[PDB]
Amino acid sequence: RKPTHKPCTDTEYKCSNGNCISQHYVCDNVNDCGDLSDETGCNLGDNRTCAENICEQNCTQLSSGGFICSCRPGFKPSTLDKNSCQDINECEEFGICPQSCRNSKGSYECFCVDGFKSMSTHYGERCAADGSPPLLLLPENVRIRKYNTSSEKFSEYLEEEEHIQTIDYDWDPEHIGLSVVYYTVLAQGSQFGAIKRAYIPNFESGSNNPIREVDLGLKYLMQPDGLAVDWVGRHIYWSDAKSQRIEVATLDGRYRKWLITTQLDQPAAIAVNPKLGLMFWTDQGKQPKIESAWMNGEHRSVLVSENLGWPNGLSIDYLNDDRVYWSDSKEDVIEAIKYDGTDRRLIINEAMKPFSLDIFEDKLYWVAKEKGEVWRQNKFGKENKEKVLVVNPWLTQVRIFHQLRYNQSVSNPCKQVCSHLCLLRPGGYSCACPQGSDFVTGSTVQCDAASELPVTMPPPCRCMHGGNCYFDENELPKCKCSSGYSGEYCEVG
Amino acid sequence: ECGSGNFRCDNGYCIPASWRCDGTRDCLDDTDEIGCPPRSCESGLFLCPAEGTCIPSSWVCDEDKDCSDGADEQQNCAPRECSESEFRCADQQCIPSRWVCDQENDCGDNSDERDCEMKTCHPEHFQCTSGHCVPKALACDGRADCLDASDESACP
Amino acid sequence: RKPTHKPCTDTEYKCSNGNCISQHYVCDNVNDCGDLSDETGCNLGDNRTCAENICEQNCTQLSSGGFICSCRPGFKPSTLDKNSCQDINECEEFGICPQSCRNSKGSYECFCVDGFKSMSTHYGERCAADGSPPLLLLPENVRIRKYNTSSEKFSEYLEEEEHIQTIDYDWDPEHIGLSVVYYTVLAQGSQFGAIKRAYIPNFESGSNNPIREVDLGLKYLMQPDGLAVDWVGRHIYWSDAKSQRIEVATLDGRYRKWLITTQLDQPAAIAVNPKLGLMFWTDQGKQPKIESAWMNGEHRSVLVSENLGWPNGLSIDYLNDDRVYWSDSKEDVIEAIKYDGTDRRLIINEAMKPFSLDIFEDKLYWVAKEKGEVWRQNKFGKENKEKVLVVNPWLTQVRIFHQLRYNQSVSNPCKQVCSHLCLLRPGGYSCACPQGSDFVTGSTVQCDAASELPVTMPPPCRCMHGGNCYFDENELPKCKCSSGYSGEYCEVG
Amino acid sequence: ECGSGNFRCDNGYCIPASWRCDGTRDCLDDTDEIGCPPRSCESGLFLCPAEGTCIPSSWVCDEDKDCSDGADEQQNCAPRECSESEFRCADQQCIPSRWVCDQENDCGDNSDERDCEMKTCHPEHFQCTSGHCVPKALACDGRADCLDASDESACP
Numbered sequence A, C: 001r002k003p004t005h006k007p008c009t010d011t012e013y014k015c016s017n018g019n020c021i022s023q024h025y026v027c028d029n030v031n032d033c034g035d036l037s038d039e040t041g042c043n044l045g046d047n048r049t050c051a052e053n054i055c056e057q058n059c060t061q062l063s064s065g066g067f068i069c070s071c072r073p074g075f076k077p078s079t080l081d082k083n084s085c086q087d088i089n090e091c092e093e094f095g096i097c098p099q100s101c102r103n104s105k106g107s108y109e110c111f112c113v114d115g116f117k118s119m120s121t122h123y124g125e126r127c128a129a130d131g132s133p134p135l136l137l138l139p140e141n142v143r144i145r146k147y148n149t150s151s152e153k154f155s156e157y158l159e160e161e162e163h164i165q166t167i168d169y170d171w172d173p174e175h176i177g178l179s180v181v182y183y184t185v186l187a188q189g190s191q192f193g194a195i196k197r198a199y200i201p202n203f204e205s206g207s208n209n210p211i212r213e214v215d216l217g218l219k220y221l222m223q224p225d226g227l228a229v230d231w232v233g234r235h236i237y238w239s240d241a242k243s244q245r246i247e248v249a250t251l252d253g254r255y256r257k258w259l260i261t262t263q264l265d266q267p268a269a270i271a272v273n274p275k276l277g278l279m280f281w282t283d284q285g286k287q288p289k290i291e292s293a294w295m296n297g298e299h300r301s302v303l304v305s306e307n308l309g310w311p312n313g314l315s316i317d318y319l320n321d322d323r324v325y326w327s328d329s330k331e332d333v334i335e336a337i338k339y340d341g342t343d344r345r346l347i348i349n350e351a352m353k354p355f356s357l358d359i360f361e362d363k364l365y366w367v368a369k370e371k372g373e374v375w376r377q378n379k380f381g382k383e384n385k386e387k388v389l390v391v392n393p394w395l396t397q398v399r400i401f402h403q404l405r406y407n408q409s410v411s412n413p414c415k416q417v418c419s420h421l422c423l424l425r426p427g428g429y430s431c432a433c434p435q436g437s438d439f440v441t442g443s444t445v446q447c448d449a450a451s452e453l454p455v456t457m458p459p460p461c462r463c464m465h466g467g468n469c470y471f472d473e474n475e476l477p478k479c480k481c482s483s484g485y486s487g488e489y490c491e492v493g
Numbered sequence B, D: 001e002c003g004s005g006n007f008r009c010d011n012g013y014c015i016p017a018s019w020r021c022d023g024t025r026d027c028l029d030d031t032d033e034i035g036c037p038p039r040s041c042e043s044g045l046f047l048c049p050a051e052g053t054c055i056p057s058s059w060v061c062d063e064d065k066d067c068s069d070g071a072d073e074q075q076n077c078a079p080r081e082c083s084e085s086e087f088r089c090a091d092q093q094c095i096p097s098r099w100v101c102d103q104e105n106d107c108g109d110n111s112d113e114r115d116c117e118m119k120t121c122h123p124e125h126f127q128c129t130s131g132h133c134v135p136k137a138l139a140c141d142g143r144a145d146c147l148d149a150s151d152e153s154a155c156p
């Protein structure tokens, strides 16, 4: 904070950083400015004058050697035709703007994209969520818990379960105001696990809406350490650690196809980016690595494999250049790399062994595994860590439940041509059919495996402002509306 | 060959002409999007290929990085190891391959019974509709050796 | 269930168990009844007749040998003057009556003591709690949770704490309707733990009454694995595992005195029985044992030391002959012994490593440690186990929060004569003074250590049927009464 | 000796006569409750000593167990080991005794600083009002070697 301090007079060269050095020291071939900004240009000669219009900007006549010119603030020496200066593209700096950056001549704007109202805040400006405050999804081995970040209160949700694992959700597929979350069940004793799905209300209701669990039928499954839902392609990607493979199936569990089965030691949590048509996953075996590939499964490549411990949680910052973040529970650090793998930088260290991470707004969320705590920090590595809540050591993940985290206006490129599955890929799509089947000879669309009807989900309980759900003789849900509200679902009153 | 209104990709699969230059790689060889003129902008302005936004003739050839790619200044202005035949259970233990889903938990945690639907039974074993592997002598005998009873169903 | 089945005629001797054996087999010196009940008396002779009135009851004339007499049902051969039978004292049988037993001639009554209404139940009769349904106190390392057994719902209680351990409570000391619980804090890093106490409402209020924690000032304390509160003597007994001692102090933490400091490897949870003036504690070190002593500390003795694994939780059945139960987390069994140490019998096995136990009504409660579950079973070893709830692995104890568990009408024998402490003992009391001090010479009451004033507890929040507590300018609590209720504490409306 | 209204126990501590036969062991030798006639019951009935409940003359001498004690039929009818001088920390580690609460955490977890209020400082060390042990040369010097500043307080 400085209006103006320690001004430099005519005798003192102002430099580019306020280095108040005497004029005789300018262009003496010795750097006093600390960045050679006092040796700028260094085109010298006594018979020359500044009036000739040699330099583009800040042309001053030195006492000796003629004219010596510098750059306007926000500009740098061009290293060619040194009497000229070009604009610094400040948008390339990491963490200079919260959401978006536009370049100007020595200036920039921290605009933020649609769906984000600019909100001046403390120690910098951010952009709000333009909707209901985000929720947190906390899976314990027996139950799933919700947490309103702004209201700061829990709510009864899925209970009476066993061995819960990673969580992912699909925002309101039927637009009836109910999103669906997907949770995996570990295999205990001699019984296989499963991938189950259930509804969750986007509104404030809870503790009175009996959630009914339904299995997808994906039998012969042991340890789904990682799961991700492609909302564009309507496919669910999960990685079985014991089966040493990462595979794909439709949202209702049909047409199971193995996607990647080679060179996988222990596939950890995965992620998908339908906008770029790129899937990401982590391996935490004897050779830790972070790999990305197309949703089809082609062009598999390794992003980072150096200075990696136990990469066990990975998430993508969709709204910031599709940047990729991951959590290392062994090195105790959280790092970020661009989706192509360049510009690696650690974001936060001494993270106390983060297990899972999820990015929302200008802040990063991660779980201290052994401490059972959820921690919050600026997602660009600045500031200091903040604690959120303390929960059981059974906690396995933190996941933000909001719609802006998954851009819902990403159109699916599929033209309905595909018979069974239509996987995504950069700039387009592709056809595929279940495992143990092949295309009809001569065609790359039809496959010989017989089609299967989509699975029907039972009706959900929907009492928004209050009331209790109830099962009638045919078990359709019905709400007993509270005071001051009416309707089939107690909406208006 | 196909109709006049269907554009043909290199592999022989031909697609409707409306899908050409539609922004999506419709066919596998992605030739349906190559050889298409990029979107143009009015005179006095240029559009950055990586951004799709028009910028004026002043912003290009300004000796600095105006477009995101910045090519304008030079493109416009110019655990013991198991054997090969040993089946690996979940607990890293190695077991003989004869235990592969004989409908009885051998590896523990029913690892041997895992997903033997895609894999095929060996010639010495009979494959029934559940995918479980049973000896060929245990088919068409009046007793359901397979728990799905497909052994007694695939009989004359 | 039998009105009468397989009746025995005159020729068939009915026996004491329905052994329909022929009359010629009676008193043939070979047991056909299975208990020699067919050889009863065996006073034989043909010239003798039953009319002589030789036997007291059931005198019958055998076809040969004269008269042969048996015992009335509910009576046994006396083994002396065999023609006579005495009454079986059925009250000595374990688990024959739920709460109390009175003996009669071949009969008994399962009466239950004051404060227990007889309630016929399924598979046997029990006696109710004559009050609000019992609560459960579940200490997690960060928070304490409550659970209404009948309402089956949680309630917000003490939170924002660290390293909680064993729990004990004192029922409504001031009779203002607020009981006080005592919780110990483990020592973390290089900071000592403490013994803190706080209020808890006996009524249904919760989630809106800010509970204020206060430390007792018992500094220099590391690991209080066990704690018990003597409601009669107004003293608190705790056992420090690291300090290898079990000591006593008054309820407000004054006049600390070491009680037992010798031959203690790892003192586990303890218990006190003011009615008998006997303290009980368990050692889970290299030599497991269950020891009892007077509250004074004299007459220390070992109750059981054989077939013991890790005795880590102990509780006393006050209402049933002051019987003692304990939980063994290594042998995986829960056993019961009389307070003098005879009649040892395992109650339930395959208990899945119980950690703490607490007895209430006709049922026994224990915590499956690694499973984090609370389990319920008949306290007399019959029936089959029942599960209650599933909670975090941070669970450390289950404790029933009810007044009938601690008989409040046990008068303190102390005559206020004692200067600092008045410990209890069988049939009376005793005098003592803090550690590092001794009695004034010639007297066994006064001690030289200067007295200290009792500690003042801050006022609590009291809003029964509803409302929110609030702190005024002098921080006195005040409730904002809900609709349809009025009063300073919203009692009547 | 004491007043006529005070009953004397064997140790010399004499107690008021009202406390005699009051049901509580008032004095240590408990002689204030011995030599007192047990509570009696009306004729034709007997009171079990262990129960305090009267039962009739018919119930006694009935050749069975009427009272809880049942005496009526025969009483009425008739990790390396540390040295001796080594201080034990909480972590079983043995340390020299010079570390006992020198106000600096030596054993870890401040085990050496535990409860040195009842124990007395050794002659070579000065004891201040917090109970912490400091060398005798660190008393009355103008600086608070004890954190409670009692070293500079107990001075002439």
Ligand SMILES: *[C@@H]1O[C@H](CO)[C@@H](O[C@@H]2O[C@H](CO)[C@@H](O)[C@H](O[C@@H]3O[C@H](CO)[C@@H](O)[C@H](O)[C@@H]3O)[C@H]2NC(C)=O)[C@H](O)[C@H]1NC(C)=O
Pocket (backbone or CB within 6 Å): A113, A114, A115, A319, A407, A408, A409, A410, A411, B052
């Ligand atoms: C979620 O993804 C959608 C695309 O599926 C994004 O919508 C696009 O956002 C850009 C931002 O500037 C708009 O220009 C797009 O509008 C259209 O753009 C095309 C050129 O590509 C023009 O020819 C059209 O005339 C029009 O201006 C817009 N496209 C659509 C289909 O809405 C959206 O920004 C993104 N949202 C988030 C929060 O990431």
Ligand SMILES: *[C@@H]1O[C@H](CO)[C@@H](O[C@@H]2O[C@H](CO)[C@@H](O)[C@H](O[C@@H]3O[C@H](CO)[C@@H](O)[C@H](O)[C@@H]3O)[C@H]2NC(C)=O)[C@H](O)[C@H]1NC(C)=O
Pocket (backbone or CB within 6 Å): C113, C114, C115, C319, C407, C408, C409, C410, C411, D052
């Ligand atoms: C909690 O302890 C109290 C004693 O502190 C128990 O109260 C006593 O219970 C017995 C049960 O039958 C009663 O007789 C007692 O009444 C009195 O008993 C004496 C003889 O000891 C007589 O002389 C008196 O006339 C009177 O009948 C009763 N004593 C008191 C002081 O109430 C109580 O049962 C017990 N409660 C529970 C639930 O354990």
Ligand SMILES: *[C@@H]1O[C@H](CO)[C@@H](O[C@@H]2O[C@H](CO)[C@@H](O)[C@H](O)[C@H]2NC(C)=O)[C@H](O)[C@H]1NC(C)=O
Pocket (backbone or CB within 6 Å): A131, A132, A133, A148, A149, A150, A151, A152, A202, A203, A204, A205
């Ligand atoms: C999470 O908490 C916020 C408040 O911090 C809730 O937002 C308000 O919800 C009420 C519900 O009736 C609305 O009437 C208000 O208009 C909302 N205020 C704002 C700031 O939008 C939000 O609904 C809560 N969400 C859940 C699911 O609990």
Ligand SMILES: *[C@@H]1O[C@H](CO)[C@@H](O[C@@H]2O[C@H](CO)[C@@H](O)[C@H](O)[C@H]2NC(C)=O)[C@H](O)[C@H]1NC(C)=O
Pocket (backbone or CB within 6 Å): C131, C132, C133, C148, C149, C150, C151, C152, C202, C203, C204, C205
């Ligand atoms: C525990 O639950 C029981 C109900 O199962 C509660 O008992 C009732 O409480 C209400 C409170 O207004 C009383 O009006 C009823 O008369 C009670 N019924 C019975 C059977 O007594 C009990 O209050 C609950 N206790 C707590 C602390 O939650």
Ligand SMILES: *[C@@H]1O[C@H](CO)[C@@H](O)[C@H](O)[C@H]1NC(C)=O
Pocket (backbone or CB within 6 Å): A014, A056, A057, A058, A059, A071, A072
């Ligand atoms: C020269 O630099 C000054 C700041 O020192 C600035 O105000 C002025 O606009 C500049 N002029 C030119 C021509 O660069």
Ligand SMILES: *[C@@H]1O[C@H](CO)[C@@H](O)[C@H](O)[C@H]1NC(C)=O
Pocket (backbone or CB within 6 Å): C014, C056, C057, C058, C059, C071, C072
């Ligand atoms: C003899 O036994 C019968 C039951 O078999 C019983 O009903 C009867 O009262 C008994 N009589 C005597 C005198 O014991």
Ligand SMILES: *[C@H]1O[C@H](CO)[C@H](O)[C@H](O)[C@H]1NC(C)=O
Pocket (backbone or CB within 6 Å): B119, B120, B121, B122, B123
């Ligand atoms: C079917 O395929 C499996 C997996 O490759 C085995 O090779 C098996 O032997 C095959 N069965 C036959 C009959 O060839």
Ligand SMILES: *[C@H]1O[C@H](CO)[C@H](O)[C@H](O)[C@H]1NC(C)=O
Pocket (backbone or CB within 6 Å): D119, D120, D121, D122, D123
């Ligand atoms: C005080 O007592 C402790 C503990 O017994 C030590 O013996 C110490 O040496 C004593 N101090 C003195 C001065 O004798």
Ligand SMILES: [Ca+2]
Pocket (backbone or CB within 6 Å): A025, A026, A027, A028, A029, A030, A031, A032, A033, A038, A039
């Ligand atoms: Ca210089």
Ligand SMILES: [Ca+2]
Pocket (backbone or CB within 6 Å): A087, A088, A089, A090, A103, A104, A105, A106, A107, A108
């Ligand atoms: Ca700029």
Ligand SMILES: [Ca+2]
Pocket (backbone or CB within 6 Å): B019, B020, B021, B022, B023, B024, B025, B026, B027, B032, B033
């Ligand atoms: Ca196309």
Ligand SMILES: [Ca+2]
Pocket (backbone or CB within 6 Å): B058, B059, B060, B061, B062, B063, B064, B065, B066, B072, B073
């Ligand atoms: Ca340019």
Ligand SMILES: [Ca+2]
Pocket (backbone or CB within 6 Å): B099, B100, B101, B102, B103, B104, B105, B106, B107, B112, B113
């Ligand atoms: Ca098998």
Ligand SMILES: [Ca+2]
Pocket (backbone or CB within 6 Å): B138, B139, B140, B141, B142, B143, B144, B145, B146, B151, B152
């Ligand atoms: Ca067969």
Ligand SMILES: [Ca+2]
Pocket (backbone or CB within 6 Å): C025, C026, C027, C028, C029, C030, C031, C032, C033, C038, C039
């Ligand atoms: Ca016989």
Ligand SMILES: [Ca+2]
Pocket (backbone or CB within 6 Å): C087, C088, C089, C090, C103, C104, C105, C106, C107, C108
């Ligand atoms: Ca009887």
